[PDB]
Every structure is written in C-alpha cells, then in structure tokens.
Swiss-Prot record, chains A, B:
Phosphorylated on serine and threonine residues. Forms an icosahedral capsid with a T=4 symmetry composed of 240 copies of the capsid protein surrounded by a lipid membrane through which penetrate 80 spikes composed of trimers of E1-E2 heterodimers. The capsid protein binds to the viral RNA genome at a site adjacent to a ribosome binding site for viral genome translation following genome release. Possesses a protease activity that results in its autocatalytic cleavage from the nascent structural protein. This is Capsid protein. The chain holds residues 114 to 275 of 1254 of the full protein. The very N-terminus plays a role in the particle assembly process. The N-terminus also contains a nuclear localization signal and a supraphysiological nuclear export signal (supraNES), which is an unusually strong NES that mediates host CRM1 binding in the absence of RanGTP and thus can bind CRM1, not only in the nucleus, but also in the cytoplasm. The C-terminus functions as a protease during translation to cleave itself from the translating structural polyprotein. Residues 1-13 are annotated as: Ribosome-binding.
Length: 162, 162
C-alpha cells in the first residue's frame, strides 16, 4: 500500500522550502490557495509560487497566498470525511483515532512540516505541522477543517515544531 | 479462553502495590492518568509512578495522579460501551447484568483490589475494588464511568474490601 501511497504523492505536486540548499519544510497548494509553514525559513522550490506575496497567520503560525485560477485547475482536494482508521503520508502510514494522529517512534522530525495527510481516495484530511515524542509512537500536531468550513489547529501540549 | 484473555492482560503493563513484600492491591494508568485504591496500603511497584504526588478521593476511597507525557506513551484505554453480557479480568471471566458484576464464589479476595475489567477489545469498562458473598456467586464492588463522563461507584451494603 505504502508504495501506492508514494505513487499518489508523486502525482501530487509538492515543493520543499529550500534555504542554502537545505530543506527546512514543505509547501503546497490546496483548495486553490498556497500555504506555507511560517516557522520555516527559506523559499519554496518554485519561482512561480515564490513570486507570489504571502499573508501571515500568527495565530496558527502559517502563511498563505492566492493562486491564479489557471493554476487552480489542478490543486489538492480537501474532504471533511475523517473517520477513524489509518491514513497516508510521505513517511508511510498514520494512525487516526480520538481525532488524533499517531505514528511509530522515529518517524517525523524538524523540517518535515507541510506534509499533508491523505485518505484512501487521495483527498486531504489534514496537514502535519509538528509533533511530539510519545514513547513507542509520536503524536502529530495538525490542522483540520470542520464541515462548516471552520479552521481548527490541533496541537498537543508543548508539542515540538517538526 | 481464559488463558487467552489473561495473556492479553499480561501484555498490558500492571503494577502491584507492595508492602513488606506483600501485594495488597494493584494500580495502573488509564487515559494517561494514574489511579490507586486508597484503602490499599503500601507503595506501587514502580518508582516513576511512586515519584508522583497523588490526590485523595474519600467519596470513592481512591487516589489518583497525573502521568508524565512520556509515560502516557502507552496506557490503558477506557470505554463507555458497557452492554450486558460477559467481560474479562485477571481471575477469568465475569458476568455483567443489572449494572452489576458477578462471579462464581471463591473468586476474588482481599489484595485483588485494582484489577480492571476489560471487554473483547481490551477496553476498560470498570475497576474492581471489592465484593461480597452472594451464595453460589459473589457480587463485586466496582467503579465505572457513563457516556456522560459521570463517575459511578456500585457498592453493595457492607461489601467486603477485596
């Protein structure tokens, strides 16, 4: 499955945040709008997107920008269907339960910010912003949206910026 | 079967309450919080948990404490799904009916306090604190929590501290 997960991720257009040749995070376009982890320093690996001026969101420590409709023709598709089970991301699978994402220990670290979470249909259900070590596993800090279109950021107490 | 159920209980990490080398009860962590039967004298077989200062609950004769996030990595999962039928515990199976737990006579005694009752999913539905002789069987004094999040203690009149 994870093989197929990566293949779908490869089809999905994603761009790392390059600074002095180092990836400090990741950024992509969802719902026809560009997003970037604010805590991450550097520029997106895309001159076209980098040419766009972003707006800040301190509350959630995120930046965003509007994408031209012609480029909106193909962007990431979000869904509200977030049932318990397992989802997919760059670093393999992720366990979703109690409204929380958890993964095996040693998975995820500083600079991985921006990695989206996809369902079985390849639809976005959340975006990974950070996480915190939880013994045999780690708890992820993510952002998700209600069916009412409400933006909610879930961050474990004293979670580290991953 | 009871072998299988106990084997799963063995996989679950539990810590007895040691006093002068004698087990007077049991204590464990559920939902990332430590619980201990107050009527039980002695100290838990766990320095890390013992290092924690507990709060008292006279109403239920119970003590509890907050567990470090790192130690919350793997704790017991509680559920509110408590249908009539049979559940599992250290001393085999247990019958649940009329909101009460009952077992064959000669099962359970002083020092067994702290033993939880789990379902087929390994979820906790109640914790055994004591019991009372009821002819061919015995009625257990237990604590359980409703879907409303209400702490409810079921204790027969003049029930014995088991």
């Amino acid at each position: 499955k994870r093989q197929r997960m990566v293949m779908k991720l490869e089809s999905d257009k994603t761009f790392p945040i390059m600074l002095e040749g180092k990836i400090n995070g990741y950024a992509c376009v969802v719902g026809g709008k560009l997003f970037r982890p604010m805590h991450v320093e550097g520029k997106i690996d895309n001159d076209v997107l980098a040419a766009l001026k972003t707006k800040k969101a301190s509350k959630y420590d995120l930046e965003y920008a509007d994408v031209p409709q012609n480029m909106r023709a193909d962007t990431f598709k979000y869904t509200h269907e977030k049932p318990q089970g397992y989802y997919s991301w760059h670093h393999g699978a992720v366990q979703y339960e109690n409204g929380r994402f958890t993964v095996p220990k040693g998975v995820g670290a500083k600079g991985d910010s921006g990695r989206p979470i996809l369902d079985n249909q390849g639809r976005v259900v959340a975006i990974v912003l950070g996480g915190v070590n939880e013994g045999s596993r780690t708890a992820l800090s993510v952002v998700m949206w209600n069916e009412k279109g409400v933006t909610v950021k879930y961050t474990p107490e004293n979670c580290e910026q991953w």
